[PDB]
Each structure stands twice: as C-alpha cells, then as structure tokens.
Amino acid sequence: SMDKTGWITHCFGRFLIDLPPDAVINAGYYLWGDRIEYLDDKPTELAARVDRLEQEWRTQRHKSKGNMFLRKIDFGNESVGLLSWSSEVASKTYLLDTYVTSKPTWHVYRWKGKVSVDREQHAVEISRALARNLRSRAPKEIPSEPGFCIDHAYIAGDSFQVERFGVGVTFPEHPGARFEFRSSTGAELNSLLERVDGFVQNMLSTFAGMETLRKGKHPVGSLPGEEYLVAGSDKGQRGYTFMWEVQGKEESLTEPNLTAGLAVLERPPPPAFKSDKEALELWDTIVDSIRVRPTS
C-alpha cells in the first residue's frame, strides 16, 4: 500500500490515478451518453464489418415496404458512419453508427447512438470532429495535451463535452475486494454526506455488527472530496464499504462528479485484508493519488 514501489500511474478521462502492478483493470468510456468502444480490427476487418452491416440493414424491413438503411456517411480522417432508422417503426429518429479511427497509430472505435431527424446533421458534425480529435497514445504514454483519455487513445480538446468513465479494479493479493473509480460531467445536487448520512446512521443504529471507521472531509489536492467508510463483522468475515466523492461543478471537465469506492462482501473464503489498518492504507494510497492530468 503505502510503499508505492512498482505502482503504475494510469489514465482515465481527465484524471490520473496510481495502482499496484498486480491490479486487474477494466474500463468503460462514454461520450454524449453513448458508449465509445474499442475494437481490435485491422483496417480490412473494419471494412468487412461495415460492408456486412450495411447489407444487413438493407435486407431488413422497415414499416411496410421499405428497408432500414438510409446512408453511409464519410467523416473523413479514415472514419465512417452508418445511418439507419431507429427501429422497424420509423418514428422520427435514426441510429447513427459511428466508426472513428485514431491517429497516427491505427485503432478503431465504435460510437453508436440514436438521433432525431432534426438533429442528424448536428450529430454528423460531432462525429466529423471526433474523427479529427481522436488521437492515439502510446502504451505507457501520459499525454501532455488537453483531452479525454480512453482505451489506447484520447479525445483531444478542452472544449466542453459530456463525458464519463467507469473503471473496475480487483487485486490478486486482496481477493474478494473490488475497487471502482468513476468520472461523470454534471454536478450532483447533494454532497456525499448531505445525501447518504441520515440513512447510514439509521442502519447503524438499527442493525448490529458495523461501525463508521471514518467520515467527513478528505480533500485530495484541489479536489474537495468527502468520504464515508463503514466496516463490520459477520460470518467470521470482515466486510467493508468505502466511498470518496467530489460532487463536481456544472459544465466542467476538470471538476466533474468524481467517485472512488471499495467494497468487500460477506457470505470462510480467504481474507481480503489482514486488518482494518491494511485496508485503509490501500484505500488512502489510491484515493490520494487521484489528480487531474497536468495539461499544457
């Protein structure tokens, strides 16, 4: 824990975070509500996918006597899009399946979502730009440029954009334990304590076998993070439920809603930790490493 030797600093969206080298990491990234998704397709494979999927939309009935395919849009920068009706019933909505590529190193990402007839051109203009802003980042590179980092790449820019990610992390040394780190634009209406506190006291006072290890402020650098940590024993198993949270500012990339959490279930398998001490060391070491990525 406190001995951050061999620990690896990672990139997720606008932020950085240190983690032990043993950690098993799995991340999800979302843009304008819709998931941006990495594909391990070499250029020929993607061409096959798009061709295969285009013909599928054509051999699929829309309403009575028309197919579901509409357009194959070219966003340039080696990227493409497929416009289709939102479903078998027209409504007034499409499905814009975007396939953006990274530069200079080749990767392709699928970014798909529904859009109305009256906003299709706008959505295209977004994909048009996402295509020329999506740049690749080297395996261990920590980009100095402004941008939202994703899998094997980042979306360059400091212009506002709703963005969100969620990283699930497990540790082999500490089995049963699960850490999660999430970011999301938009501000929550209450702080952590203002929201959850009342109910936690009503559960702790009601049910036995638990104690509030910590509570209150836990600022990390310029980030105003409150925290709540609960622990308890049952089944001869020691359970944990931690959380840290910056409630974030509206229309802000650098101070969005930002949450770190760690939990260990009960219900004897091997201990996730030796004691409460070891658990809070890991928790504090990781949370204190949270920070906005320095950007020129």
Residue numbers in the entry: 32 to 298, 305 to 333
Share the article's original sentences.
P. aeruginosa encodes three distinct T6SS hemolysin coregulated protein (Hcp) secretion islands (named H1-to H3-T6SS) that act against both prokaryotic and eukaryotic cells. TplE, a novel H2-T6SS-dependent lipase effector, was recently identified. TplE is an antibacterial lipolytic toxin and TplEi interacts with TplE to provide protection from TplE. TplE, a new T6SS trans-kingdom toxin, targets the conserved and essential cell membranes of rival bacteria to cause bacteriolysis, while TplEi functions as a cognate immunity protein to prevent self-intoxication.
Next, we also obtained crystals of TplEi alone and determined the structure at 3.06 Å resolution using SAD. The structure of TplEi alone is very similar to that observed in the peptide-bound form, with only a handful of side chains with different rotamer conformations. Specifically, the side chains of residues such as Mse274 move out to avoid clashes, F230 and R209 are closer to the peptide, and residues E219, E211, and K266 change their side chain conformations to form hydrogen bonds or salt bridges with the peptide. The similarity between the free and peptide-bound forms suggests that the TplEi structure is highly compact and rigid, and the “L” peptide binds via a structurally stable pocket on TplEi. TplEi is assembled into a highly rigid structure, not only in the apo but also in the peptide-bound structure.
